[PDB]
Write a protein that binds this DNA or RNA. Sequence first.
DNA 1: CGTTTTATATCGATCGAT
DNA 2: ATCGATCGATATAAAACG
Lengths: 101, 180, 116
Amino acid sequence: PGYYELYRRSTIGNSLVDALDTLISDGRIEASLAMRVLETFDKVVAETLKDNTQSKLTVKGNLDTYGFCDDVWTFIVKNCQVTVEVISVDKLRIVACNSKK
Amino acid sequence: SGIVPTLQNIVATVTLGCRLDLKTVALHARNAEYNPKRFAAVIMRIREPKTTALIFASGKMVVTGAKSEDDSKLASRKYARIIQKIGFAAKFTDFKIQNIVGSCDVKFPIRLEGLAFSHGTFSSYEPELFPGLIYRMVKPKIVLLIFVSGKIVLTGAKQREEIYQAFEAIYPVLSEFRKM
Amino acid sequence: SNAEASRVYEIIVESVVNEVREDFENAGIDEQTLQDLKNIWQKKLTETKVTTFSWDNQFNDYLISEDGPDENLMLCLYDKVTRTKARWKCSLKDGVVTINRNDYTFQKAQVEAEWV
DNA sequence: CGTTTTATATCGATCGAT
DNA sequence: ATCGATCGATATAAAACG
C-alpha cells in the first residue's frame, strides 16, 4: 500500500538520502526511522508534483534504447531537443511508472 | 504481367532448445518488453535486420518483419545469440518460415464488385466491413486482398514462389476488371 | 534557474518534515534532530546547484548496462506509450528531470523519439 | 483469446485547433 | 461547434502457449 520509489533517485530525493545517512552514522536516528522518512518522501513527492506542477516540456530525439518490465518504462534518448516552459541534450535517460494501479 | 510482387514480411519460428526465464531475458536484453499479464512472452526488436522476435519460456520463438529468407534466418540467429550472451544454453534449431506476405501495384483501378460477382466462390467483398476484396485462391493456396487502387496484397505463402505464382494467376482477372 | 522546480523542492522538504515529525516523536528522537535533518537536507540541495533556493543565502551492445549529478535523468509517470514502426510517442506526467546540472519539474511531458 | 509483422484503405472518433 | 489529423477497429496468413 505505497507510492513508487523512483523519485528517491532524483536530485532532491538523493539529497534526502545523504542527509539521512549522516544522521544514521552520527547515531542520531535509527535506520528504520530513515526508511520511514524515505517512504513519506515517496508520497509527498507524488502529491507535490501532482498539485504544484504547471510546466509542460517535450522531448524530441532518437530513441537509443527502450525497455518495459514490471510496469516500468525506460528510455534512453540521444541527440534530442528538450523544450521547457529549448535545450540540446546528448543523452537523456527516462524512467517512468504507471499512472494507474 | 511484367510485374514482380515485393516481399514485405516473413514470419519464422525457431526452437532454441532450452527453457527460458523470461523475467531474466527482459532484464538483460535491451529493447525488450515483458508484460506477462497480457502475453506470456518477451518481445524483442533488433535493427539489423529490422525485425521483432517473440521469445517464450519454452525456448521457442517467432521472428517477424523480415523481408527476405536470408534476413529472417540471419535475424533469428542474432536473437538466439543474445539469449546465449545473456546466459542460456540456447541453440539455433528448427528454423522454418511459416508465412510470407507480398504486395503489388498493377497501376490501374479495379471494379471490385464486378470481380466479386464473377468469382463468387473465391472472393468476399463487402466494403462495409473492409474496403478490399478478399480472394481465396486455390492453387497456390494464397489469400489476396484486392483494392480499387490496383494495390494487391498476397499472403499465406511458405515459399516466395507461391506469391509470384499467385500474382500471375490473378493478373488476367485483375486486367479483365480494370476500370477503363 | 527554474522557479517551479525551486518551489516544488522547498514545498517537499517542508512537507516531509511535517509528515515525519509524528514518527520522530514516536521514535524518541527530539525536534532538534528533525530540524537538523531539514538543515542538512537544505545544505545538500544547495550544494548541487540544480536551482536556487530561498535558504541559499544561509549557505554562502545488445545487453543492458553512470548515475550521478552529470547523468541527465527523467523520473516520472506515464499516461500512454505507443509506437508505429520505429516512431515512439510518450505522454508523461508529474515528473522531475535533471538536464546538464539543472533541474526542471513538469505536469506533462511529450516524447517523440524514433528508434532508428 | 491475446501479441507481432505488414501492405492496403475506409469509417467513426476525439483532437488540438479554428 | 467544424477542420486535416491521428486513432482505433476491420480484414489476411501464421506460429508460439498459459
